[PDB]
């Protein structure tokens, strides 16, 4: 199987590249940066790395030209590339709101549409997993674009699941709570902050990239044949309520 994973240079998407490579998949890795993939690019692993700014829809079109010319058509798409602003909403510029939208929502849409197109043409049973967030279900401060983008992606998941259901293409999302990655690593040296995170959820611990990889493994498995349009929350109780 061929799996295409965005966000491959860091955090959850990188954990996925490593995991799926170890399980003998052919991996197409998409990211705007590649410093964490250079070593692997020098090996003979079945890894194709594309350096791509997924905020640029022209660039995504060029990616599918390249993939089609290389006869590479993934079976599975993991939309994990994403960005998060931390900024007072009055200081969030038009261009920055748009940028978050373009990465977190538009790119998943376009990548999903293109893979679905090729699956419908070839009559293949594809699978998409969208990395949303608990911010797709509730708000947080200083994250207007982020929260909007993640709400959007939950909706998109359900919509595309309905759209391609008769073609046996399954589309699901995962909504992580706090996962220790490069995105969130700054939190973990701050005592006050770690205390407040632990206060906002039920388990006295934090997630790791492997917790989300495991979920992905489940959602792409044969055991997930009846799962489509669902959102799986992996958040140590962050969304359960208020305490």
């Amino acid at each position: 199987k061929i799996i295409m994973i965005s966000g491959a240079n860091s955090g959850i998407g990188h954990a996925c590249i490593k995991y799926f490579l170890e399980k003998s998949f052919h991996v197409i890795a998409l990211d705007i940066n590649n410093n964490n993939l250079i070593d692997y690019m020098k090996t003979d692993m079945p890894l194709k790395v594309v350096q791509i700014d997924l905020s640029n829809s022209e660039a995504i079109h060029n990616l599918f030209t390249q993939l089609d010319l290389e006869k590479l058509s993934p079976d599975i798409l993991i939309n994990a590339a994403g960005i998060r602003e931390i900024t007072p909403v009055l200081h969030l510029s038009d261009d920055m709101f748009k940028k978050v939208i373009d990465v977190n929502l538009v790119a998943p849409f376009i990548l999903s549409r293109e893979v679905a197109k090729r699956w419908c043409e070839s009559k293949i049973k594809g699978c998409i997993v969208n990395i949303a967030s608990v911010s797709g279900l509730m708000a947080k401060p200083e994250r207007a674009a982020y929260v909007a983008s993640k709400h959007a992606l939950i909706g998109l998941t359900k919509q595309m699941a309905m759209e391609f259901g008769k073609q046996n293409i399954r589309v699901n999302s995962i909504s992580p709570g706090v996962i220790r990655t490069e995105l969130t690593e700054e939190y973990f040296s701050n005592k006050a902050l770690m205390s407040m995170i632990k206060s906002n959820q039920s388990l006295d611990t934090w997630g790791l990239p492997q917790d989300i990889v495991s979920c992905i493994e489940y959602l792409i498995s044969d055991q997930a044949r009846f799962i489509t349009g669902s959102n799986f929350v992996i958040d140590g109780g962050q969304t359960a309520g208020k305490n």
Copy 2:
């Protein structure tokens, strides 16, 4: 009180212009069309009509430069301008997805940020109502951008309610079900379709613009003092469940 209302040339937004002018508000009306607003312009009702493509963030910026020069700032913002594609997702182009997002989400974001900036600097207690949709809570076919945009707008509402809560700026959404307007008018002479719409909800009728205007009236009233971050569904039971 000054009320800024997008989508003012048609449908819900147009019913709003009429009703609120009738109630002695000063109205700033935004829309890309103005043919229905011309008659009202001929009167000396306190109505400013702006012809503006809200998909162009530069035209929104010019709008607000004009308003600042005129020392005109709204007390209330109704985000009602919206578009809806009906397009099988494999035929939904990058530009069209992004256009729906830019009208349905980015314009409410920018209008909201700009009014809220002026409220925070003046220490005025503002109110924003976003017209989302039941497509902000569930999916529908051939509506990938629409569903994504309406889900986004619901999360944006929650986020901005949170962001501006300490400044006493309330931000709520309304999720209509089927409302007879120029958007949906084509359905109403199709018997097959009308019967399907009625089977998909609880009440044997459809909504009218006035159903949404009355909800807006409540949400901007003093009786809505403790209401923020809420989504008011006005849908004849369309979202209640199945069968």
Copy 3:
């Protein structure tokens, strides 16, 4: 019009009694206590006070046999009677859990079923408003029964809305955030508790019974003709998210 209001001796249901008497409704008041309703009974306002334990389903059955004999069938039902435990779940007894369920869920169910039976017989357009809670959408500590009961009542509201929609019987719920009543009075003299409440929501205030009464007023109005199966959150932003 006759309006039947449970919880009539205290808090929200008492504020309803007074308000709706003032607008010329005939009121049927249901509560297990009556000390606050005594003054009202002495006047000859059109108020019928019934002292009833709504956790006793046979007493409810008798009430309706009586009401039938007296030709008092309500046109509107407001289910406001409720209780709330604050008990660590390991100390929450079988009986305490069942009682909270019986009062918060079963009583609304039976009352609703009986009023709707009479509307369907008479071909009347009835209206039910269930007072749920934000604890019907998320969890809180030491409130296992309360949370379960309120999630149930949200479900029940949707279900009855669908069941009775073709008969033009509308069924909606209100989910209050923190409303200052006898239920919550103990909180208001604890400063630390009040601070935590306020930082868990958007608005620096709390709700009053009148906030809920005005929402009731809207939902029973003719302007609510297309509203059924909806849950109206009146909560100062408490549910918007975290921070």
Copy 4:
């Protein structure tokens, strides 16, 4: 490891018995009937079978007395026993509404409290899985008690997850869509009703008990360390929206 599974005689619960015995768990099976479990007791697999009417709370307390004497505390609890009425709500009796509540909500609650009590006393981790339903998230006709009870169980899951999270007791729910079991078997020979079922979801198939077992298997695994308070929908797209 010991797992207690309710509803062990039929459908999902029975599929669990067989599966987890094959995996070397010691299984405490609970059900009001036992005819499908007789054969298993004939082998000497580590299976305790208990005949118990889980609507009877004293019978639950006697169960725990007897397990305490045998020193068998389960490590994992799967609440799968349930019932569903198909009855027009005007014909749904007080007792039948309460019965559905007692089986579908109150028994999960008591079982959960009792296992949690012993996990907290022994300072052992514990894991609960509650079998809710898509009727826990939306309504369906003729199912007032069932929709109520399943909404309640979703809320109870979230609450208990919050309540016991500091003790590392994880509590999650699974919400199946149409699973072919003895509960639903009657539908499958009805051509028209099958066609309506497929029309209401995205995938042209139905679930099997194994689909829910596999979800349980994931929720009780070490890969589920960060999952609590979550609701996993396994429904073929039934909840995605309306088509």
